[PDB]
Design a protein around this ligand. Structure first.
Ligand SMILES: *[C@@H]1O[C@H](CO)[C@@H](O[C@@H]2O[C@H](CO)[C@@H](O)[C@H](O)[C@H]2NC(C)=O)[C@H](O)[C@H]1NC(C)=O
Ligand SMILES: *[C@@H]1O[C@H](CO)[C@@H](O[C@@H]2O[C@H](CO)[C@@H](O)[C@H](O)[C@H]2NC(C)=O)[C@H](O)[C@H]1NC(C)=O
Ligand SMILES: *[C@@H]1O[C@H](CO)[C@@H](O[C@@H]2O[C@H](CO)[C@@H](O)[C@H](O)[C@H]2NC(C)=O)[C@H](O)[C@H]1NC(C)=O
Ligand SMILES: *[C@@H]1O[C@H](CO)[C@@H](O[C@@H]2O[C@H](CO)[C@@H](O)[C@H](O)[C@H]2NC(C)=O)[C@H](O)[C@H]1NC(C)=O
Ligand SMILES: *[C@@H]1O[C@H](CO)[C@@H](O[C@@H]2O[C@H](CO)[C@@H](O)[C@H](O)[C@H]2NC(C)=O)[C@H](O)[C@H]1NC(C)=O
Ligand SMILES: CC(=O)N[C@@H]1[C@@H](O)[C@H](O)[C@@H](CO)O[C@H]1O
Ligand SMILES: *[C@@H]1O[C@H](CO)[C@@H](O)[C@H](O)[C@H]1NC(C)=O
Ligand SMILES: *[C@@H]1O[C@H](CO)[C@@H](O)[C@H](O)[C@H]1NC(C)=O
Ligand SMILES: *[C@@H]1O[C@H](CO)[C@@H](O)[C@H](O)[C@H]1NC(C)=O
Ligand SMILES: *[C@@H]1O[C@H](CO)[C@@H](O)[C@H](O)[C@H]1NC(C)=O
Ligand SMILES: *[C@@H]1O[C@H](CO)[C@@H](O)[C@H](O)[C@H]1NC(C)=O
Lengths: 124, 49, 96, 262, 49, 24
């Protein structure tokens, strides 16, 4: 339940390890998906199956009014759940997580597009 | 009308967590940013469509 | 005119719910994008004529002045694999 | 200690269509509900498996070994007991012994000076019991390098009657000095042939041996002549490099396969 | 600050109104974990030495 | 129509949700 560099039996990778509900056959050591990428592993000492999640990543995108108008900016961590951002105002979206933008209940017309129905603007 | 927006971090595709490979890939110049400009240009035009 | 229209709408409803292939032009676009993403990830298993396709297993066997030459192969072959995908995506995106 | 077993009538080589047997898990990687394509040394579907009998009949010629091998035995009472693998088979070079006996499975690698008709022999008097008597396989064993023995067990040498009941299947491959065994056991209720049906061999063991192998031989259960080898039937198939598509289910077991060149 | 990241990335002292991609975020690994089978076949140097 | 990965690959959501496309 933390991001770590793992090395089980030379199968080096980096991700979040967590308990799997998969059961391997007694002899199988690694688990792969349709992409032929390792997504599960059985620990070689305490024989149990661990799911590997690729630990979180995404584009930073900066939302701004024009330079002349203002300097203030809001930041989008695309595809990131912001339980992971402070490690480096807040509002989670399906597009990723905004910081510095204020969330409002009123539906204005879309000025700067963000994603998943969300847009941003500069306002009082 | 549209297709799935996709995006790549070129460094995680080519060089996933190797700083050596990351410092070697840097020799090739703008090639990864040119790929991201292309894919983000496909991504925005899905909304335009 | 109403009874003909109300029947024709009923035939659309049944047809879409009955046959597999009617959504073909959309399912094809989902399948081409899945196939291209799958192909792009599979290219990471390819050696490109280097000693290995696993970047850490190159670094764990050769010293730096020649481990760089193997890593340069994988960089070249993977960069060629992204360029093939992005060219396919651009040409497709022009179709869409 | 050996004496030749020349008491055998000449018969021609029997053959059969190996239906879809001899598939094995090609790497130790779990796959769930997916179709996986691989290239490895496999027994082709519908290919001519060679077939042998012990009965009056005792079929232990030296066999080629090349690009790996498949072995199977429709059995009762465990007459098939092991195999011998190497390239000179004469103590000039190291060679590999596999034996199962009335105490243990055992594996050894040595310059064995093997004998010309190697076998395991047994006490068979009118007292209704069977006991080991004759380890008649070799004389010398010099500069040995790999050895293993199982935890000690008891197995039934008892002459169980009727049709064949136990089917064992094995694959033996040498790659880059590693010697790989894969195997499957199943119950069967059938008269004589290799069964139409599908099953995959799980990996049994991998040994870091580092010897060439170009020829193999088989070890069977039996005043120096005149004896009965109990009825057992065994099969050999030779693997070729070929592409297969394997279906894995949600449990990660091979459930069906396709030989791309059939 | 993120404004300076965009100015630098766009190569301009003025950035127009919009949304601008920079610098991919990636969770760093906390520590490095190594796992191998239980150790068993200790070579018997005790009966040598 | 029957329809975040390891190697730097991601999918991004459309600016209009399938609710907003339904509403238009
Ligand atoms: C590897 O060694 C570990 C040593 O800790 C073994 O773990 C113990 O296993 C027993 C099995 O009955 C448990 O009762 C103990 O609780 C375990 N120890 C601890 C500290 O939890 C493990 O079984 C060994 N595995 C193999 C495959 O040898
Ligand atoms: C983002 O991650 C947080 C956890 O870091 C998620 O919060 C959990 O949500 C589940 C489902 O409602 C609850 O059972 C947990 O108790 C929550 N824990 C915490 C710490 O929040 C959150 O749901 C995630 N959001 C998205 C959109 O993925
Ligand atoms: C077993 O039979 C073989 C013959 O089939 C015997 O081996 C031959 O022995 C002579 C010397 O006595 C050699 O010149 C031949 O070249 C050998 N031939 C083979 C095929 O090896 C062997 O001596 C017999 N051994 C016993 C104990 O019966
Ligand atoms: C099965 O084969 C093995 C190897 O030849 C036999 O094991 C030896 O048995 C003797 C007598 O019990 C012991 O003194 C040795 O120390 C054993 N050696 C090894 C390497 O284990 C075993 O006895 C055989 N069983 C039968 C029924 O013949
Ligand atoms: C996958 O393996 C599991 C465990 O062997 C099988 O699940 C069992 O199925 C039987 C028959 O329905 C049930 O009575 C058991 O209660 C199940 N056990 C468990 C632990 O779930 C399952 O059938 C196998 N899948 C296939 C396709 O054979
Ligand atoms: C295109 C545009 O709006 N440019 C603005 C201008 O309107 C404004 O008067 C000036 C004041 O700082 O900054 C710049
Ligand atoms: C926005 O609406 C939610 C209910 O959907 C409510 O809980 C919240 O207080 C509202 N915010 C404001 C600023 O009125
Ligand atoms: C298998 O052997 C039989 C003879 O027993 C022969 O008729 C047949 O053509 C052979 N087929 C193949 C594929 O070897
Ligand atoms: C049965 O075994 C005993 C030794 O336990 C032996 O004396 C006897 O001769 C054996 N029976 C026969 C028929 O030889
Ligand atoms: C196996 O065969 C090759 C080719 O003849 C040879 O180079 C190698 O040394 C042999 N191995 C042994 C252990 O003799
Ligand atoms: C030798 O044995 C003693 C006790 O029997 C032990 O303390 C010591 O470490 C051993 N030395 C070696 C090299 O095994």
């Amino acid at each position: 339940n933390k991001c770590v560099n793992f090395n089980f039996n030379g199968l080096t990778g980096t991700g979040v390890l967590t308990e799997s509900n998969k059961k391997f056959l007694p002899f199988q050591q690694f688990g792969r998906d349709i992409d032929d990428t390792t997504d599960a592993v059985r620990d070689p000492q305490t024989l149990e199956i661990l799911d590997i999640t690729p630990c979180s990543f995404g584009g930073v995108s900066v939302i701004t009014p024009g330079t002349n108008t203002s300097n203030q900016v809001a930041v989008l961590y695309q595809g990131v759940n912001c339980t992971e951002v402070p490690v480096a105002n807040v509002f989670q979206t399906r597009a990723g997580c905004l910081i510095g933008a204020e969330h409002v209940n009123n539906s204005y017309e879309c000025d700067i597009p963000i994603g998943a129905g969300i847009c941003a603007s500069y306002q009082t | 009308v549209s297709m799935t927006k996709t995006s790549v971090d070129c460094t995680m595709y080519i060089c996933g967590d190797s700083t050596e490979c990351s410092n070697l890939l840097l020799q090739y110049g703008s090639f990864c940013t040119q790929l991201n400009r292309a894919l983000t240009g496909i991504a925005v035009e899905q909304d335009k469509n | 005119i109403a009874n003909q229209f109300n029947s024709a709408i009923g035939k659309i409803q049944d047809s879409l719910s009955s046959t597999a292939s009617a959504l073909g032009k959309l399912q094809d676009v989902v399948n081409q994008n899945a196939q291209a993403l799958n192909t792009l990830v599979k290219q990471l298993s390819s050696n490109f004529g280097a000693i290995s396709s696993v970047l850490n297993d190159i670094l764990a066997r050769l010293d730096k002045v020649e481990a760089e030459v193997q890593i340069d192969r994988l960089i070249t072959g993977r960069l060629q694999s992204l360029q093939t995908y992005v060219t396919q995506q651009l040409i497709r995106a022009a179709e869409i | 200690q050996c004496v030749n077993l020349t008491t055998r009538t000449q018969l021609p080589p029997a053959y059969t269509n190996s239906f879809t047997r001899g598939v094995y898990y090609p790497d130790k990687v779990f796959r769930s509900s997916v179709l996986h394509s691989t290239q490895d040394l496999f027994l082709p579907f519908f290919s001519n498996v060679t077939w042998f009998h012990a009965i009056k009949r005792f079929d232990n010629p030296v066999l080629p070994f090349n690009d790996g091998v498949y072995f199977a035995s429709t059995e009762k009472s465990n007459i098939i007991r092991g195999w011998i693998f190497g390239t000179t088979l004469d103590s000039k070079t190291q060679s590999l012994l596999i034996v199962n006996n009335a105490t243990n499975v055992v594996i050894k690698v040595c310059e064995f000076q093997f004998c010309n008709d190697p076998f395991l022999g047994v006490y068979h008097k009118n007292n209704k019991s069977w006991m080991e008597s004759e380890f008649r396989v070799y004389s010398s064993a010099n500069n040995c390098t790999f050895e293993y023995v199982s935890q000690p067990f008891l197995m039934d040498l008892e002459g169980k009657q009727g049709n064949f009941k136990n089917l064992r299947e094995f694959v033996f491959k040498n790659i880059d000095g590693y010697f790989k065994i894969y195997s499957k056991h199943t119950p069967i209720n059938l008269v004589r042939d290799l069964p139409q049906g599908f099953s995959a061999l799980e990996p049994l063991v991998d040994l870091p041996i580092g010897i060439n192998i170009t020829r193999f031989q088989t070890l069977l259960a039996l005043s120096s002549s005149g004896w009965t080898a109990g009825a057992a039937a065994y099969y050999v198939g030779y693997l070729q490099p070929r592409t297969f598509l394997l279906k894995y289910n949600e449990n990660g077991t091979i459930t069906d396969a396709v030989d791309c060149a059939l | 600050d993120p404004l300076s990241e965009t100015k630098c990335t766009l190569k301009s002292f003025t950035v127009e109104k919009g949304i601008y991609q920079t610098s991919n975020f990636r969770v760093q690994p906390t520590e490095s974990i190594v796992r191998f089978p239980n150790i068993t076949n200790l070579c018997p140097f005790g009966e040598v030495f | 129509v029957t329809l975040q990965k390891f190697n730097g690959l991601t999918v991004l959501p459309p600016l209009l949700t399938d609710e907003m496309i339904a509403q238009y």
